[PDB]
DNA sequence: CAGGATGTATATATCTGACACGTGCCTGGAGACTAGGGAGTAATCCCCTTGGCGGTTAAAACGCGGGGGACAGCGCGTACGTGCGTTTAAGCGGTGCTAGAGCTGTCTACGACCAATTGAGCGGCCTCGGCACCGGGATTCTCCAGGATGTTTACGT
DNA sequence: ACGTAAACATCCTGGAGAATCCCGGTGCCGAGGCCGCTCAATTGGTCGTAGACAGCTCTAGCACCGCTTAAACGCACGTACGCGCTGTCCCCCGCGTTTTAACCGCCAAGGGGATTACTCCCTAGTCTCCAGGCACGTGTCAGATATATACATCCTG
């Protein structure tokens, strides 16, 4: 399973993973702290999981710097 | 006869500015105050033709709100508030 | 015998009888069904309840206890489905949804 | 003193008090809601009439209304609507 | 003396006019224009008081929605000033011009 | 002009052509 | 979540908000400027 | 059996009256029949709405002419209604 | 019995079926009753519209030196007329193609 | 037999030909996916209404009449199919 | 030494050729298979007439071509020749499809 | 800045034949000829709503002037989209072949039309209070320019 | 190589309007009770639409196999894109100052609409006849393919 986060970021995830866990993936790859990231798919909160947002493989995620 | 300025100058520069600001545009060029007047005249001719046609068919000599709202609905722009 | 209104027996507040009369006199078909006015009145009631609930929430947000057409416009245009349903409708005295393009706003 | 007019004002107010017990509605908003009810009713009824002319039928039964409402309202709205409508019809079957 | 930076009062006006819901076109000039334009179609026409209000309010909504679309065209061309070509192309895409 | 055989007169002489606005 | 006192349950829960599509402001810049953001981040 | 009503023969008749030395394809004939049916439905629906305007239960030539005037744009309308008037002013002339 | 029957279309001077238009108006339940002159007016308007469209199509076909009217000629005749294009603004014609036209800026200069 | 990855059927040269008939000269590479998504959305919108008409008619096949009348519903009425 | 055409001028010949003709441009089998695949979710085990699929072909092609006409207008507006996906999105927004 | 060559188009003449065009048959739909009765047609009147009049007077339009931010033009670097040659995955077509399911004729019966009764749900008519407008003060909130602390050249050696 | 100073470069901040909070007086208009009446619910009949059911057949889906064809891939290459720099210039934001929109009141009356009597046009219904749909049968005169050439672009001194 794969998704795309817009710069364009490629992250491997799982259906039950939460946004904050996915938010940490950007930190490891791009070095951007999660607290300075606002994710768009509507804003996705850290606690809610990917499946709660109906996010599937190759989903369209957007990253805007704070 | 009211064919002196065609009364279209009534819709003036600050009025167009207010309408555009309500639209949500930061800056307005000076060549738009005539394009918007032309667009307004075209739209009002289009609507008033149908409204007056509805009035003429009903054998009455006044333009009621019903004719205007139903002409607008026919043109594809429904308008709530004045009946319907 | 004692007569109870059709809306009460259908569990509705919208007038099923008036809707049936409008369907009959509206020249839509030669005949109309018994359950058609019930279905149509229920649908109208549901739609009205939805838009009214959204408008009342907007009014509660705006610190007001009675609904102004501005509240109706704010409610209808803030819901994707309702706005799509009312995409070609101009509500009286409704104004517009307050939004700005991101380019116009200062960067920082 | 004559020429009484028919409006959905009483019904709209009743459902409003069913949703928000402590919220009123102005006359302009009441007219907005009455016009909206009229417009949606006309849309659904006209589509049902055309959709009954479709299959060479002469009766606008509940099925025509359900199909029109499933084909006019967008998204889950339509879905929800039909459910509500079906419930109402079911009550008609239960109480006779 | 104090002077705002050219371009910030515009956002103030935008917010003020979007939050509010009054009528932005003077009622008497618009009514006079309506009477003049309807005079050509049929002479000696009387207009209901609520007929002109519906005519003006519906006309205002069309212009406002048009300016929302023409604002989108201006930004799309990497600008902020709306221009007559923006209105013309927005109308053409909307299907009114051609 | 226009017309033609049993359609004498009537019709629409010199009809308006399409504009096809160019940007 | 929705409720509504007299209208218990039913209705619609979690309506979809309007998209309000935006013009060309995606915060997209050159990779060199983007690379400098990572160092700051 | 199972006959199908269509405007094919009438469309061919007017085609031959307006161009006595040309033909028409089957698909073109179907398109013309669909166009005629659609315009008929549009005008009749507008006439029905205009009848429902003034609490009138009948459809006359007056409101169908008004509907044609509303629908057809510009010079076309000014032609069509005139044509329609002709078709009436002679219809009552000879019975 | 009666005399020799003759169609209302002959009375109206049309070859469009005024009788069939009357039957369609009655069976289409647009109104409770329909007048005598309403089908005549509808038939006349339909006749004029189809005559104009067919004449333009035949003119385009003879321009393309093709004496049989095909669906391609219908768009060439309809969209080339501004009034007819406005009438059929939201109408798509099967196998109609598009109008040959290219934007001026796309064309190379001298 | 279910189907998957069927939107790739509209191939790149077909999209280029459609654009050429549209009246363009140069096509960005990112077009060949946004326009596929647009086509999929339009097909969803039309097919939903066609299927609704077919379901109402108590029949198991989608006839051409249902398709053209669904097209007319969306303000995109189509001539040439016995409307 | 081999003959080479300057870029941008073959596209004019292609534009003239596909604007003068009227046949279908998308291949029939992939479009029919796509239509079945997208309609199978609404109602399982469906069936389509030959004219039903062809009618969807004409509707899709007319819509796609008309959209590309408006897309070119947007791209020309931005003082450029190529067309970007944002041109398509803005053309859809102005028409009111994605508003 | 004028000559030459090319793969693009123009035309001509053949087949070649699916196919619009006559042509019967006849049948269902249209026309002719009666009564029957409401829907529309005239005439009257009654509010009454619409238009037009004349003083404030203050809000909004209008004109002017400095200037700064945006528009527009030109230039440079590149990556990406196009034109072209070579497979190759698959469209297209031609022909059996089966059975699901679309049409169509029949019987029936059940749901809808309609008519006379009866009552109550809803429309209009006052009526009172309270919710929203408005006035103004004090209060924070935004936004501006300005002195102030880092920074990487750009000069030097 | 290598010192310090220098214009930019931007967090920090004081102070001048702008938008809020709150408090209070006040109308004007929702919410509600009331009388009534016209219209919806009851009950009964009748009757014809639409469920079902059974059969016939249309064609939709499935397959197989050649062929040939657009698609996919790669690969030079140029050219349009996008950023940047610069130079106007023309909307901006205020500051006076002119104008007239809005208000309030008064008046005259045009006609929208409701009432009442009339009449005649549309419908229902019978009966009869014929125009259009269907199935035949075309003879074709409209659609390809085999060639003959002009020529727009990319080379040339």
From TrEMBL, chain B:
Coiled coil: none annotated. GO terms for molecular function: DNA binding; protein heterodimerization activity; structural constituent of chromatin. The keyword Cell division does not apply. GO terms for biological process: nucleosome assembly. Its main location: nucleus. GO terms for cellular component: nucleosome; nucleus. It is found in: Chromosome; Nucleus. Keywords: Acetylation, Chromosome, Citrullination, DNA-binding, Hydroxylation, Isopeptide bond, Methylation, Nucleosome core, Nucleus, Phosphoprotein, Ubl conjugation. Residues 9-74 form the TATA box binding protein associated factor (TAF) histone-like fold domain. It comes from the Eukaryota. Core component of nucleosome. Nucleosomes wrap and compact DNA into chromatin, limiting DNA accessibility to the cellular machineries which require DNA as a template. Histones thereby play a central role in transcription regulation, DNA repair, DNA replication and chromosomal stability. DNA accessibility is regulated via a complex set of post-translational modifications of histones, also called histone code, and nucleosome remodeling. The nucleosome is a histone octamer containing two molecules each of H2A, H2B, H3 and H4 assembled in one H3-H4 heterotetramer and two H2A-H2B heterodimers. The octamer wraps approximately 147 bp of DNA. Belongs to the histone H4 family. This is Histone H4. The chain holds residues 33 to 116 of 116 of the full protein.
UniProtKB/TrEMBL annotation, chain I:
This is Histone H2A. The lineage of its organism: Eukaryota, Metazoa, Chordata, Craniata, Vertebrata. It comes from Xenopus laevis. Residues 82-110 form the Histone H2A C-terminal domain. Residues 1-79 form the Core Histone H2A/H2B/H3 domain. GO terms for molecular function: DNA binding; protein heterodimerization activity; structural constituent of chromatin. GO terms for biological process: heterochromatin formation. Residues 1-9 have a biased composition (Basic residues). Core component of nucleosome. Nucleosomes wrap and compact DNA into chromatin, limiting DNA accessibility to the cellular machineries which require DNA as a template. Histones thereby play a central role in transcription regulation, DNA repair, DNA replication and chromosomal stability. DNA accessibility is regulated via a complex set of post-translational modifications of histones, also called histone code, and nucleosome remodeling. Its main location: nucleus. The nucleosome is a histone octamer containing two molecules each of H2A, H2B, H3 and H4 assembled in one H3-H4 heterotetramer and two H2A-H2B heterodimers. The octamer wraps approximately 147 bp of DNA. Keywords: Acetylation, Chromosome, DNA-binding, Isopeptide bond, Nucleosome core, Nucleus, Phosphoprotein, Ubl conjugation.
């Amino acid at each position: 399973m794969q998704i795309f986060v817009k710069k364009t970021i490629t992250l491997e995830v799982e259906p039950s993973d939460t946004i904050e866990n996915v938010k940490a993936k950007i930190q490891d790859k791009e070095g951007i702290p999660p607290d300075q990231q606002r994710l768009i798919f509507k804003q996705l909160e850290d606690g809610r999981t990917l499946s709660d947002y109906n996010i599937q493989k190759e989903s369209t995620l957007h990253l805007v710097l704070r | 006869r009211k064919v002196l300025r065609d009364n279209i100058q009534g819709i003036t520069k600050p009025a167009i500015r207010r309408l555009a600001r309500r639209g949500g545009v930061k800056r307005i060029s000076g060549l738009i105050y005539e394009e918007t007047r032309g667009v307004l005249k075209v739209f009002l001719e289009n609507v008033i033709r149908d409204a007056v046609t509805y009035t003429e068919h009903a054998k009455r000599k006044t333009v009621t709100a019903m004719d205007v709202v139903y002409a607008l609905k026919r043109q594809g722009r429904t308008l709530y508030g004045f009946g319907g | 015998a004692k007569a109870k209104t059709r809306s009460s027996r259908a569990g509705l507040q919208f007038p099923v009888g008036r809707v049936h009369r409008l369907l009959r006199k509206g020249n839509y078909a030669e005949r109309v069904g018994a359950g058609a006015p019930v279905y149509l009145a229920a649908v109208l009631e549901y739609l009205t309840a939805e838009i009214l609930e959204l408008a009342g929430n907007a009014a509660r947000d705006n610190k007001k206890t009675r609904i102004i057409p501005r509240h109706l416009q704010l409610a209808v245009r803030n819901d994707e489905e309702l706005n799509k349903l009312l995409g070609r409708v101009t509500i009286a005295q409704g104004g517009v949804l307050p939004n700005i393009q991101s380019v116009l706003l200062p960067k920082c | 003193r004559k020429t009484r007019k028919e409006s959905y004002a009483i019904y709209v107010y009743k459902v409003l008090k069913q949703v928000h017990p402590d919220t009123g509605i102005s006359s302009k908003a009441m007219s907005i809601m009455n016009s909206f009810v009229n417009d949606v009713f006309e849309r659904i009824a006209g589509e049902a009439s055309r959709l009954a002319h479709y299959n060479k039928r002469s009766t606008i039964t509940s099925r025509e209304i359900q199909t029109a409402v499933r084909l006019l309202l967008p998204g889950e709205l339509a879905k929800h609507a039909v459910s509500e409508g079906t419930k109402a019809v079911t009550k008609y079957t239960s109480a006779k | 003396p104090h002077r705002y930076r050219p371009g910030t009062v515009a956002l103030r006006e935008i917010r003020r006019y979007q939050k509010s819901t009054e009528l932005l076109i003077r009622k008497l000039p618009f009514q006079r224009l309506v009477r003049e334009i309807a005079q050509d179609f049929k002479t000696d026409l009387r207009f209901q008081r609520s007929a002109v209000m519906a005519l003006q309010e519906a006309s205002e909504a069309y212009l406002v929605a048009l300016f929302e679309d023409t604002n989108l065209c201006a930004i799309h061309a990497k600008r902020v000033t709306i221009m007559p070509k923006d209105i013309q192309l927005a109308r053409r895409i909307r299907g009114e011009r051609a | 002009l226009r017309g033609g055989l049993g359609w004498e007169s009537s019709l629409r002489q010199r009809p308006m052509p399409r504009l096809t606005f160019q940007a | 979540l929705r409720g509504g006192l007299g209208w218990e349950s039913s209705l619609r829960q979690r309506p979809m908000p309007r998209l309000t599509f935006q013009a060309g402001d995606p915060y997209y810049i050159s990779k060199r400027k983007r690379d400098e953001w990572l160092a700051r981040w």
